[PDB]
């Protein structure tokens, strides 16, 4: 049920998408950095509590769900001085009490073998 189109959505977490690069390369859209994160972790408490870690893996690394077009959904990829590497470290961390301080599938904030 963690699948995109399933209990996640397609193309999840955009604005998570943009409050990593808005860290990690500087670019992003003009809001404040308060609004982005909200945005953000408002975006994955929407997604059942189970699914959370898989939608960051989603959103890190990116998944191709089966089907004759199924196209690439998410994934971090380089921007002009700003490699995929430096964005996936920070982005693992969004659950975290640091960051969004949302529980997962253990029930507590931590998704440990979200990164790599």
């Known amino acids: 049920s963690c699948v995109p189109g399933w209990a996640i959505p397609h193309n999840p977490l955009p604005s998570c998408r943009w409050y990593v690069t808005s860290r990690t390369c500087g670019i992003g859209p003009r809001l404040?950095?308060?609004?982005?994160?909200?945005?953000?972790?408002?975006?994955?408490?929407?997604?059942?509590?189970?699914?959370?870690?898989?939608?960051?893996?989603?959103?890190?690394?990116?998944?191709?769900?089966?089907?004759?077009?199924?196209?690439?959904?998410?994934?971090?990829?380089?921007?002009?001085?700003?490699?995929?590497?430096?964005q996936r470290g920070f982005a693992a961390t969004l659950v975290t009490e640091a960051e969004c301080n949302l529980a997962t599938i253990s029930g507590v904030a931590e998704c440990p073998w979200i990164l790599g």
């Open 32 to 86: 404040p950095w308060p609004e982005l994160k909200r945005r953000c972790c408002r975006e994955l408490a929407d997604i059942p509590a189970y699914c959370r870690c898989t939608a960051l893996s989603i959103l890190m690394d990116g998944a191709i769900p089966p089907g004759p077009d199924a196209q690439l959904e998410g994934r971090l990829e380089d921007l002009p001085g700003c490699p995929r590497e430096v």
